[PDB]
Amino acid sequence: PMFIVNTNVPRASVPDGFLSELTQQLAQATGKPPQYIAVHVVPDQLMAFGGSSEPCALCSLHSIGKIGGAQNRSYSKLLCGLLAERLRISPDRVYINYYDMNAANVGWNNATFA
Amino acid sequence: PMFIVNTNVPRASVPDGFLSELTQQLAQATGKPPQYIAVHVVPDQLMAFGGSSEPCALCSLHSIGKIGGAQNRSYSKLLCGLLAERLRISPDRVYINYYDMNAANVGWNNATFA
Amino acid sequence: PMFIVNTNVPRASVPDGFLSELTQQLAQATGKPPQYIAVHVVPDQLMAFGGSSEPCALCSLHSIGKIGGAQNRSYSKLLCGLLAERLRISPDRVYINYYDMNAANVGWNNATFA
Incomplete structure (x- = not known):
C-alpha cells in the first residue's frame, strides 16, 4: 500500500516519527506487512479547501485489494484521526x-505484482 | 472536487488570488458547492512536455460524478484558459x-461519501 | 503518456539530461511520439518505503492505452533500470x-483526446 498526504501545514509542524507512525498504523489497518507500506508527506503546499487556506490535506491511499466501502470508512476514521x-x-478539511x-x-x- | 496543477512556472509567476479563482470557477463549472472544492498548485517543478522545458502543466481533476466526455471538454477549455x-x-502543453x-x-x- | 517520479533522492543527485532520457525511453517503450510524452521528477521528498528512508521512489505512468500486464512488466523493467x-x-524500493x-x-x- 502507498499513502500520500499533501498539506499546507509547514514542515516544522510535522512531528519526528510521523512517517513511522503512518507505516505502522497502515500495516495494522490494511493487514499488510510494513515492508510493503510506502508513505509520503508533502508539507508547505499552496492549497485551499472550500476556498480557505486554513490547514487542510489532500491524500491518496493505493492498495492491491483491501479497499471497499467499509474498509475505506475505517481507514478514513484512522487517517483523519492521525x-x-x-x-x-x-477532519472536515x-x-x-x-x-x-x-x-x-x-x-x-x-x-509487476501480477 | 479536487484540482491539482503541477507546473514548471515559478512561484512568483502565480498571481495573487489564483487559488480563489480556481475554486470559484470550478464550483461553477462542476455545479458543486464551493465548500467542497479543493485546489492545489505546485510551481517550480522539474518537468518536461514533449521533451521541452518551456512552460507546461500536468494536472488532475477528481470529482464524485460530474465527469464525462462533454463535461471534461468544458473543464479543459476552462482550465487551459485559466x-x-x-x-x-x-494549452497544448x-x-x-x-x-x-x-x-x-x-x-x-x-x-466516506457513500 | 505522462510519467511522474517522487523520490527522497536529493536534487543534486538527479543527473543532467535525465528528463530527456526519460522522455526518449518512454516514447520508445510506449511507441508514442516523444512530442506526446510528459515527464516530471520530484526530488527531496519526505518518504519512507517499508519503514525506512534509504533511496526510494513512488511513481505513476498514465497513458491512453498501451497499458496491460505484459506492457507494464516491460515498463517496470525499463523504469526501475533507469x-x-x-x-x-x-528496484525493490x-x-x-x-x-x-x-x-x-x-x-x-x-x-479532450476523444
Whole structure:
C-alpha cells in the first residue's frame, strides 16, 4: 500500500516519527506487512479547501485489494484521526482518494505484482 | 472536487488570488458547492512536455460524478484558459487527467461519501 | 503518456539530461511520439518505503492505452533500470502505479483526446 498526504501545514509542524507512525498504523489497518507500506508527506503546499487556506490535506491511499466501502470508512476514521492529532488538521478539511489497484497495474522490482 | 496543477512556472509567476479563482470557477463549472472544492498548485517543478522545458502543466481533476466526455471538454477549455491567462502556459502543453470517483472511494470528515 | 517520479533522492543527485532520457525511453517503450510524452521528477521528498528512508521512489505512468500486464512488466523493467542506474534507487524500493486512461478523460489543448 502507498499513502500520500499533501498539506499546507509547514514542515516544522510535522512531528519526528510521523512517517513511522503512518507505516505502522497502515500495516495494522490494511493487514499488510510494513515492508510493503510506502508513505509520503508533502508539507508547505499552496492549497485551499472550500476556498480557505486554513490547514487542510489532500491524500491518496493505493492498495492491491483491501479497499471497499467499509474498509475505506475505517481507514478514513484512522487517517483523519492521525491528521487531526499530529498535524492539527480538521477532519472536515481532509480528502482521501482510495484506489483499488489491479496487481498487474503496479510496478515494483522490475516487473509487476501480477 | 479536487484540482491539482503541477507546473514548471515559478512561484512568483502565480498571481495573487489564483487559488480563489480556481475554486470559484470550478464550483461553477462542476455545479458543486464551493465548500467542497479543493485546489492545489505546485510551481517550480522539474518537468518536461514533449521533451521541452518551456512552460507546461500536468494536472488532475477528481470529482464524485460530474465527469464525462462533454463535461471534461468544458473543464479543459476552462482550465487551459485559466492556465494560459494566469500562468502563460500554452494549452497544448497541458495535460489534465479526469477521475470519476466512486463516493465510497472518497474519504472526508472521518468517513466516506457513500 | 505522462510519467511522474517522487523520490527522497536529493536534487543534486538527479543527473543532467535525465528528463530527456526519460522522455526518449518512454516514447520508445510506449511507441508514442516523444512530442506526446510528459515527464516530471520530484526530488527531496519526505518518504519512507517499508519503514525506512534509504533511496526510494513512488511513481505513476498514465497513458491512453498501451497499458496491460505484459506492457507494464516491460515498463517496470525499463523504469526501475533507469532509476537504479541514474538515481541509485534499488528496484525493490520503487512502486509505479499504471493507469489506462480513457481518451475522453484526458484534457489537452482546450478539449479532450476523444
